[PDB]
Write a protein that binds this ligand. Structure first.
Ligand SMILES: [Ca+2]
Ligand SMILES: [Ca+2]
Ligand SMILES: [Cl-]
Ligand SMILES: [Cl-]
Ligand SMILES: [Cl-]
Ligand code: NA
Ligand code: NA
Lengths: 590, 1446
């Protein structure tokens, strides 16, 4: 009824190119009404795409993207409503040569434009990249990246280094590759940071006649990550920069069967004792170092994840308990209709039979239009801050009250309203104001007028205000550089691939400071109470960033009383990988 | 351009030879091709195919098959050649040639004494010939010595790829008169040479007397003519541009790196005896079915069958080692098995064998064939013939094909002077091949008296011969020799004054009367019979004389000549009782040879003619119950079924009923009807006569009130049905062909093809719990016969259901006319029409695709494609007969999707073509969508809005995309290279819908002065492409066509608009220069068109001729550095690459396959594979240095690894193996294993049966039971129930492989053996994949390969040590699409779970495909549906939520 006669439709021109994508919108609130949504696309004589537009902007006679192409189809220019205008040209060898971006259309505001260029080896060499350059507006060009390659001396061959980049100087400093396997896996890499890397004023500019000069712009400290690998080129062990060793083992099918951690100057301890799999190779049963067992359950037909069951089993020193028993109910295409948890200790949902347990409803476009859940009665209205931690664990259904969220979406799939309706309290509404000519959008408190929305964004689609009186600065590469209030700041640094290597937070009244350095399987966290160290912390992280991770906290200095050193924190996730429970090395809830 | 990178062959899936059945054509024949599996060497190689045709006759590879290179032969189809200036020659394509014209319009002759720059001993007259239809524009020369005594003539064919071929230079490559070498029937390919200086040489063996009986030698002294292909040499060591046959002496055998050796029975056939390079000393074997052919006016005798083809490589030479006393080593071996038979020998198996270094054989499963056969045992008995019940049993009738319909009707005289004919017809509601006879038609009145000619059947030609006994006999002219009425030589001697009477005694055999060789005397009323009949199976009316104890046959050699008498033993009757009247001559077994049927009072005795050599022991056939044959009775042999084989029709007055028939066979024997690859795939083929098809067609034409006109007067055996069985899934595909508008041409005595083919494809599935609705597809296709009275009736039959579709295309005829040249249309004369229409024979006119699914839209096609043809007439020395080049100039495709009113439509037109057939100007047109109708033509279940919303203005824009191009050629001097890439440009034209011509575009409307692609009209420049060459004049090609670079346009003035707000002219341009782009002239320029920015790609430096012009360096652009290439000794393969950073890769080669086995990378680490005798990777490892020290696996020198012999052994290996991977291949597992010990023990006979079954190829020497060898044995000798029991308990399983992968180096004691098993089917498709996993819960496989299941119905679970995860399990339909794809599952065994258990118990998504092979529906394992609907202008997708609401 809701989904009846709502197909996806592809409309061709007379050359078999897609002129229109048609969709059919229907809200369960109003099942009588069906809104047809047409996304037009234009092509030129050659058959290359020139224009696209969403239904909302087509309705208003405007366009989302315009494309200008060379005669082979290569896109030399994109004018986007959301991300501005940019010009691109590859050389005849197919390599990046120039990109000019941060340009706005009205002809073309070129004044804040970033020009990125590449320099390769000369024609008598293979043509590997030598440096990347970035020139912003009227400022002098800065050399943001450099590459140095190995020759093929016997020593280099012995390290499987021949012709590969051994020194990559990037936006954060240097990455040095000192050893490679027969299988091609990096066995020893070494990172050094820029001098004065905590200051967001310091940008990489690798000026100088050779490596002797470039190295003089780097800090002294070396963060060495070492790796061990099997005959298939698959990682077995990782030694982090503070000497902590992570180890894994593979079963006869090549799947992870166990893992261990050896903290520096300690003995090896079990992080994953065992791990079995279904026929499809998806986790079935997982046994942790803390004796906690995870049992995963799958629909036999669709292989969809039906159950996540976490428990301390029979004969466990801390006493048997089911900590989580998640169950999922899908609609036919695999949207989540219902989530139940019978292990929930408070027994909250069988007490409150007015609103149902995590029920979700969707429109014909599979957008979430309604949801129900529980919140803690004390949370109050959602903003940017995290609620206050309730300590200790609440012990009764009074602690949590139910809620029902309702979501509203425009013709271009912008989320314009989150409406919150609790059981027995005053509800609130968060309104998001969409631009009249783009999908740029901000909360109502920033503006309630569509025509002023794009002025809160840079040309490239980067938001300049986070909240009222909190300002945002972005790098030349559109990464978040700095959050500043208009007196607590935060700022960031990234490597060559835009992956955050550094975060520094500062509060000045005396200036209190915290720093996070992100390395392989390791976060070095520190703090100073005005150039005097209050805290020094290794967060050892075991696993992969898209799966239920295990953290170990080791304090070099400044451990607070009430935390035993080298305490492991096991994390336990839901369907979407959100961290829901933490347990300790006894399996007890943290 | 492809930059050469060295790498080892990757692992792996089981697949065969590349054997393939042909698409069903308008000739109606079954075809089959096997590529000969042998090395390509350097690249220049023989590349031959062993191919079958149902139309083809006997030869060195058995009935139907051949494997030979190009030849030129004297024409034999239009009279026998006499070796004078009046003879004609045939091109390799079989097409008649004439002497060509030159620039000045004369006979293109010249004298020469230099050929390819090489002085010839004397002068030659060199005549260019041109074939009537031009395929490739090959140049063909006849080389004739000026003084005829100086030598023999030869032919040269210059292929337009730049290669040069010479035929019959030396006498071994000539089929010539045994009596007189001057008289040359055929010149066979002897040597090829390419522009790189690479050669292939073809060596033939002449026929001879070795291993023949003295009986044979006596009967056939003229036996030296025939040639057999014997050795092919390639990979010449010395690079030479000129042909080797032009040097003083030919190269030594040792100057060729590769050989291909055709064995004719001399070597031991056994897979255990390794064939050697030299032949041994027992000589080639004599086939039993020896046969002669007389086409060329000379006997050509045939005694040899090819039993093996062998690939030999010179391993020492290739490895730059000492060549002294090198024997070439065998690489691959192809065995050929025949069913040897005295009448007809047939090819029943080909198999690949190779050898391990310990000498022991390794084998692929044999590819088997079998044929329709005549069974001596089950001859159908008599049966009453109610079709003749209107006659009383005394009344004389002839069963004869009076009108030329390929089936005989009834000719009879009612009262004297009054002759009627009852024409054959389909009996309604009988068997589907049942023949009845229609209404009487009076013949014309016949003259007072005379033997004389007459046009009895009303076809215009005097082709019936009337005589009188006073009775009257009708005899077709084709049953007598060709110049019967103006005889010469022996024919004159025999008839003298002229014969008194001619009497048919069979379908094409005729008895005679009257009142250098020793010919017979035609006595008045003797105890002897004389006749014309084909007693030899060569296809001529020979002279035969039969007495009571002798059969003598004199071969017709043409022009009235008759050669020495041949005897045929095995026929006799007592000298008192022998009566000539009781003798009949007819091909009973369809072997080609007329057999003897002799009639006694109570039986018939049939003497089968054995390939014209002798007669068999006679088959005795009893007459019906209580019949006594005598003078009152009537008996004749006549092909009443229309099968090309005689049945017998008998009238007996003293009997009830009076009329009987005996059909001796219901199939035409010796036609291929079964292939089986022994891997799970069998194809069964079914034939049906064109004659039988004609009676179906005639009934339809009569039911519709029209007058039928047959144009095909004899029965051809057409490919009617194919059934392709998947023996593993139990699924199949049926392909049925139907034929109409058959055309044979009297004037040229040539078959033209069928005017209409209807093809029906139907999937058949085994039963499942989620059933797939099978919906057959129908393709209806029309082809030109080139006879206009047929071709003009075809468009009438096209689908008329779209009143707005454009009108049918019409053939254009052109003449080439020069100017600063071009095609110009003309209307030819009725004389030239015949030849120019003939040039379109077999060309596709129109094709329509349907799905016969019983829906309302079923009568409406998915798509319709139609073609227009242009024949360009070309002059020759013959004024009466022009040459012709047919091409396809327009192609129009309509996409309807079974909705008639709203199709999409596109059209591609070749406007101009150069003199060599290459396209110069062409255009691709996309028509606008039709004006929107008032109501929606699409079904009412879609959204109401969609029909209106389906419309877009982009659908209404007419697009024409114009493409120009030109080419390099090298025709100067005596070289010939055509169509080399040069320049191309593309231009876009776009108009509104009003400007589309109302009746569509034609070529004419596009070349007209007011054209929408005229140079007046505005356009959008789309780009251009140029190839530049090196090593010749400027950037023009030499004969070696060495590319300098490729150049394509990247920016024009329009595309530079990109930079307008960001860069300025000066900065923009100097960036483009530094980016490696450059300005070049815009091609096919118009007035004021600026230069364009171009990118250049693909630079190579090549070697000189001594290095076979091989590439020595490569780079993609001038911005990056070059990579060096170093070759091995003989420039076969590259052994080292070195890049611009000095980084070095090296490779050593396994020279039996010319693939690397070892590889040193840039860091000097080593990679290694062991290849098996078929070139597959059975083991691999690597080692080198890592982190300062030696690393990886132990070396093959340190720790050699033996690959286990079986999967069982391999699954039982202990950790510590020094290989990354190893692989066991089981390609023959679908064949049951049967050992001598199995057999000998189960009988207690000491191998008496085993050695009988091995001989009969029921089982292979290595113990595999052959599918068709079994069936053949079971049909002839049966099989005891003791053997059947044994065989029923021996299982089988789909082709499979096991790959073991180690996860650690062998130094590490943690090493595990990962185990992966793949299953393939008989079509080479991946069936399932099994990965060994840790012990745990799995489902259960029984010994019978089924799933164990609980009483509750769900699979029974157990914990097991032997657990496997099965993934990607797929059930395929006929077209190879995944019809069911199963979820992964655990199983306590690597073995195959039956498709039977899978369908019942395992979860699977079902995918349903439409007649275009597009997925339109999916039924998910849970029960839901995804559906998809295809229309010309939109596609509609519905997911599981959408469809669930229905
Ligand atoms: Ca829908
Ligand atoms: Ca015969
Ligand atoms: Cl707890
Ligand atoms: Cl117009
Ligand atoms: Cl070798
Ligand atoms: Na006639
Ligand atoms: Na190395």
């Amino acid at each position: 009824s809701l989904f009846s006669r709502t197909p996806k439709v592809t409309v061709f021109d007379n050359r078999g190119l897609t002129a229109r994508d048609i969709a059919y919108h229907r809200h369960p609130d109003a099942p009588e009404v069906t809104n047809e949504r047409i996304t037009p696309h234009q092509y030129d004589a050659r058959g290359f795409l020139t224009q696209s537009a969403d239904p909302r902007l087509h309705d208003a006679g405007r366009v989302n993207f315009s494309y200008l192409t060379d005669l082979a189809g290569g896109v030399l220019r994109t004018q986007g409503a959301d991300n501005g205008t940019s010009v691109s040209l590859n050389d005849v060898a197919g390599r990046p040569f120039i990109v000019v971006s941060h340009i706005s259309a009205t002809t073309e505001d070129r004044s804040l434009a970033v020009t990125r260029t590449w320099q390769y080896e000369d024609a008598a060499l293979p043509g590997r990249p030598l440096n990347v350059t970035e020139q912003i507006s009227t400022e002098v060009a800065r050399i943001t990246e450099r590459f140095v390659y190995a020759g093929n001396t016997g020593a280099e061959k012995t390290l499987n280094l021949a012709g590969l980049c051994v020194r990559h100087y990037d936006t954060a400093g240097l990455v040095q590759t000192d050893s490679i396997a027969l299988t091609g896996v990096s066995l020893s890499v070494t990172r050094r940071l820029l001098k004065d890397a905590d200051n967001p004023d310091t940008v990489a500019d690798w000026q100088g006649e050779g490596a002797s000069a470039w190295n003089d712009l780097l800090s002294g400290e070396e963060y060495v990550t070492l790796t061990t690998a099997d005959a298939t080129g698959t990682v077995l062990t990782t030694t982090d920069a503070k000497g902590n060793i992570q180890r894994v083992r593979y079963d006869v099918a090549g799947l992870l069967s166990g893992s261990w951690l050896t903290v520096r100057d300690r003995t090896e301890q079990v992080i994953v004792k065992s791990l079995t799999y279904s026929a499809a190779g998806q986790k079935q049963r997982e046994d942790h170092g803390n004796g906690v067992v995870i049992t995963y359950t799958y629909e036999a037909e669709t292989q969809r994840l039906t159950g996540i069951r976490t428990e301390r089993p029979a004969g466990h020193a801390s006493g048997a308990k089911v900590l989580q028993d998640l169950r999922y109910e899908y609609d036919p295409v695999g949207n989540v209709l219902k989530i139940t948890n019978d292990a929930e200790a408070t027994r909250f949902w069988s007490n409150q039979k007015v609103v149902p347990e995590n029920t979700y409803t969707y429109d014909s476009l599979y957008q979430l239009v309604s949801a129900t859940g529980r919140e803690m009665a004390n949370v109050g209205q959602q903003g940017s801050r995290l609620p206050s931690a309730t300590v200790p664990f609440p012990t009764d259904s009074s602690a949590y009250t139910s809620y029902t969220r309702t979501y509203t979406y425009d013709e271009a799939s912008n989320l314009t309203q989150i409406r919150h309706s609790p059981a027995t309290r005053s509800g609130y509404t968060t309104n998001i104001t969409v631009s009249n000519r783009s999908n740029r959008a901000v909360l109502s408190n920033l503006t309630e007028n569509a025509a002023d929305v794009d002025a809160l964004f840079t040309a490239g689609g980067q938001q300049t205000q986070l909240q009222p009186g909190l300002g945002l600065v972005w790098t030349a590469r559109n990464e978040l550089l700095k959050v500043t209030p208009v007196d607590d700041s935060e700022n960031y640094r990234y490597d060559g691939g835009s992956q955050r290597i550094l975060k520094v937070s500062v509060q000045k009244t005396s200036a209190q400071t915290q720093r996070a350095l992100y390395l392989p399987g390791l976060e070095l966290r520190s703090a100073k109470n005005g150039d005097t160290e209050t805290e020094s912390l290794q967060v050892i992280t075991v696993g992969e960033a898209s799966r239920a991770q295990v953290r170990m906290l080791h304090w070099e200095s400044g451990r607070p009383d009430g935390i035993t050193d080298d305490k492991v924190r096991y994390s336990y996730d839901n369907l979407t990988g959100s961290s829901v429970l933490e347990l300790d090395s006894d399996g007890k809830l943290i | 351009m492809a930059i050469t990178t060295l790498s080892l062959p990757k692992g792996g899936a089981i697949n065969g030879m590349g054997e393939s059945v042909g698409q069903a054509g308008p000739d109606g024949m079954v075809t089959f091709s096997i590529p000969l599996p042998f090395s390509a060497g350097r690249g220049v190689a023989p590349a031959l195919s062993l191919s079958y045709s149902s139309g083809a006759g006997n030869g060195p590879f058995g009935m139907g098959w051949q494997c030979s290179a190009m030849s030129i032969s004297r024409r034999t189809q239009k009279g026998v050649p006499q070796y004078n200036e009046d003879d004609e020659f045939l091109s390799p394509s079989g097409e008649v040639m004439a002497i060509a014209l030159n620039d000045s319009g004369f006979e293109d002759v010249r004298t020469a004494n230099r050929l390819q720059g090489i002085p010839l001993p004397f002068s030659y007259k060199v005549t260019r010939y041109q074939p009537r239809l031009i395929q490739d524009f090959i140049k063909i020369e006849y080389w004739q010595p000026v003084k005829q005594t100086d030598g023999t003539p030869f032919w040269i064919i210059y292929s337009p790829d730049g290669q040069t071929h010479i035929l019959g230079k030396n006498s071994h490559s000539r089929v010539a008169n045994a009596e007189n070498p001057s008289q040359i029937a055929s010149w066979l390919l002897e040597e090829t040479v390419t522009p790189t200086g690479e050669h292939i040489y073809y060596q033939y063996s002449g026929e001879n007397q070795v291993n023949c009986t003295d009986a044979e030698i006596a009967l056939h002294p003229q036996d030296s003519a025939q040639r057999y292909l014997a050795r092919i040499d390639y990979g010449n060591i010395s690079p030479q541009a000129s042909l080797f046959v032009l040097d003083e002496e030919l190269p030594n055998l040792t100057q060729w790196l590769f050989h291909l050796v055709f064995d004719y029975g001399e070597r031991d056939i056994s897979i255990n005896k390794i064939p050697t390079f030299e032949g041994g000393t027992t000589g080639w074997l004599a086939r039993p079915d020896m046969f002669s052919r007389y086409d060329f006016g000379i006997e050509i005798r045939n005694r040899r069958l090819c039993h093996q083809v062998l690939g030999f490589h010179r391993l020492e030479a290739l490895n730059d080692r000492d060549v002294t006393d090198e024997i070439p080593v065998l690489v691959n071996r192809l065995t050929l098995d025949y069913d040897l038979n005295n009448s007809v020998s047939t090819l029943v198996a080909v198999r690949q064998v190779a050898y391990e270094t310990d000498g022991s054989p390794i084998t692929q499963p044999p590819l088997e064939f079998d044929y329709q056969r005549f069974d001596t045992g089950s001859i159908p008995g008599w049966q009453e013939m109610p079709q003749l019940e209107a006659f009383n049993g005394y009344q004389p009738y002839q069963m004869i094909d009076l009108y030329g319909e390929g089936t005989p009707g009834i000719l009879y005289q009612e009262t004297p002077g009054a002759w009627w004919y009852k024409s054959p017809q389909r009996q309604i509601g009988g068997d589907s091949n049942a023949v009845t006879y229609g209404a009487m038609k009076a013949l014309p009145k016949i003259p007072r008296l005379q033997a004389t000619l007459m046009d009895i059947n009303g076809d215009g030609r005097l082709d019936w011969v009337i005589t009188s006994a006073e009775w009257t006999h009708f005899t077709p002219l084709n049953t007598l020799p060709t110049e019967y009425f103006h005889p010469k030589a022996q024919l004159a001697d025999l008839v003298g004054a002229g014969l008194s009477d001619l009497v048919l005694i069979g379908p094409k055999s005729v008895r005679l009367y009257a009142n250098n060789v020793s010919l017979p005397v035609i006595g008045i009323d003797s105890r002897q019979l004389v006749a014309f009949a084909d007693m030899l199976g060569s296809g001529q009316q020979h002279l035969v004389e039969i007495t009571a104890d002798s059969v003598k046959c004199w071969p017709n050699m043409g022009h009235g000549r008759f050669g020495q008498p041949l005897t045929l033993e095995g026929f006799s009757q007592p000298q008192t009782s022998f009566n000539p009247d009781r003798v009949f001559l007819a091909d009973i077994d369809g072997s080609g040879t007329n057999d003897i049927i002799y009639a006694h009072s109570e039986c018939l005795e049939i003497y089968l003619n054995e390939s014209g050599n002798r007669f068999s022991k006679p088959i005795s056939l009893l007459l019906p119950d209580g019949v006594n044959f005598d003078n009152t009775c009537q008996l004749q042999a006549a092909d009443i079924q229309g099968l090309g084989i005689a049945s017998l029709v008998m009238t007996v007055p003293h009997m009830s009923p009076t009329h009987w028939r005996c059909d001796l066979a219901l199939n035409k024997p010796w036609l291929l009807n079964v292939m089986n690859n022994n891997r799970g795939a069998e194809t069964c083929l079914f034939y049906r006569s064109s004659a039988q098809f004609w009676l179906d067609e005639k009934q339809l034409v009569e039911a519709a009130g029209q007058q039928p006109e047959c144009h095909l007067p004899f029965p051809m055996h057409l490919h009617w049905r194919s059934e392709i069985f998947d023996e593993i899934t139990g699924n199949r595909l049926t392909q049925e062909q139907e034929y109409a508008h058959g055309s044979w041409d009297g004037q040229e005595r040539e078959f033209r093809g069928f005017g209409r083919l209807i093809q029906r494809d139907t999937d058949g599935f085994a039963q499942g719990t989620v059933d797939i609705p099978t919906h057959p597809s129908r393709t209806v296709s029309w082809f030109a016969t080139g006879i206009p009275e047929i071709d003009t009736t075809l468009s009438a039959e096209f689908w008329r259901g779209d009143d707005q579709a454009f009108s049918p295309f019409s053939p254009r005829f052109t003449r080439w006319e020069n100017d600063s040249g071009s095609d110009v249309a003309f209307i030819p004369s009725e004389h030239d029409a015949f030849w120019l229409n003939r040039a379109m024979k077999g060309q596709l006119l129109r094709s329509e695709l349907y799905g016969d699914d019983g829906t309302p839209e079923a009568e409406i096609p998915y798509s319709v494609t139609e073609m227009r043809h242009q024949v360009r007439a070309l002059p020759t020395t013959d004024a009466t007969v022009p040459s012709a080049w047919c091409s396809t100039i327009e192609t129009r495709s309509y996409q309807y999707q079974r909705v008639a009113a709203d199709p999409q439509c596109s059209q591609q037109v070749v406007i101009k073509a150069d003199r060599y057939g290459s396209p110069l100007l062409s255009v691709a047109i996309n028509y606008p969508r039709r004006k929107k109708p008032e109501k929606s033509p699409y079904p009412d279940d879609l959204p109401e809005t969609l029909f209106d919303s389906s419309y877009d203005t982009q659908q209404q824009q007419l697009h024409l995309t114009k493409q120009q191009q030109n080419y390099f050629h090298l025709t100067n001097d005596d070289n010939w290279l055509l169509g080399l890439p040069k320049e191309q440009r593309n231009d876009g034209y776009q108009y509104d819908q009003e400007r589309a011509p109302a009746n569509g575009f034609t070529l004419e409307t596009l070349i007209a002065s007011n054209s929408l692609i005229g140079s007046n009209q505005p356009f959008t420049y789309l780009g251009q492409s140029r190839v530049a060459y090196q090593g010749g004049v400027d950037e023009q090609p030499s004969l070696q066509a060495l590319v300098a670079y490729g150049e394509t346009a990247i920016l024009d003035e329009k595309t530079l608009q990109a930079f307008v707000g960001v860069l300025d002219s000066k900065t923009r341009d100097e960036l483009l220069f530094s980016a490696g782009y450059q300005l070049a002239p815009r091609l096919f320029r118009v007035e004021s068109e600026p230069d364009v920015w171009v990118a250049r790609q693909g630079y190579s430096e090549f070697g000189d001729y001594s290095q076979f012009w091989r590439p020595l360096s490569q780079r993609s652009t001038l911005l990056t550095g070059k990579t060096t290439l170093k070759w091995d000794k003989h420039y076969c393969v590259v052994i080292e690459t070195q890049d611009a950073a000095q980084l070095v890769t090296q490779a050593r080669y396994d020279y039996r396959f010319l693939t690397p086995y070892s590889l040193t990378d840039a860091n000097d680490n080593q990679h290694y594979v062991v290849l098996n005798p078929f070139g597959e990777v059975i083991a691999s490892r690597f080692w080198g240095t890592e982190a300062g020290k030696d690393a990886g696996y132990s070396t093959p020198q340190a720790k050699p690894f033996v690959v286990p012999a079986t999967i069982e052994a391999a699954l039982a290996l202990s950790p510590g193996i020094p290989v990354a991977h190893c692989a066991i291949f089981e390609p023959e597992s679908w064949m049951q294993k049967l050992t001598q010990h199995d057999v000998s023990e189960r009988m207690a006979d000491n191998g008496t049966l085993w050695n009988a079954l091995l001989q009969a190829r029921f089982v292979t020497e290595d113990g595999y039971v052959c599918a068709l060898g079994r069936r053949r044995w079971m049909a002839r000798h049966g099989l005891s129930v003791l053997m059947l029991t044994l065989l029923a308990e021996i299982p089988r399983t789909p082709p499979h492989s096991l790959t073991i992968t180690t996860d650690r180096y062998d130094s590490d004691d943690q090493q595990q053996l990962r185990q992966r098993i793949l299953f393939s089917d008989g079509f080479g498709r991946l069936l399932q994949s099994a990965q060994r996993v840790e012990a745990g819960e799995s489902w259960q496989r029984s010994e019978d390969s089924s799933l164990v299941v609980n009483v509750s119905g769900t699979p029974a679970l157990v914990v097991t040590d032997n657990r496997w995860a099965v993934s990607g399990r797929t059930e395929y339909d006929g077209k190879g699409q995944g019809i069911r794809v199963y979820q992964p599952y655990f199983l306590d065994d690597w073995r195959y779970l039956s498709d039977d258990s899978a369908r019942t118990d395992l979860f699977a998504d079902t995918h349903i495909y439409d007649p275009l092979g597009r997925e339109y529906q999916v039924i998910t394992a849970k029960g839901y549906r995804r559906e998809r609907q295809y229309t010309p202008w939109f596609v509609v997708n519905q997911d599981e939520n959408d469809t669930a609401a229905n």
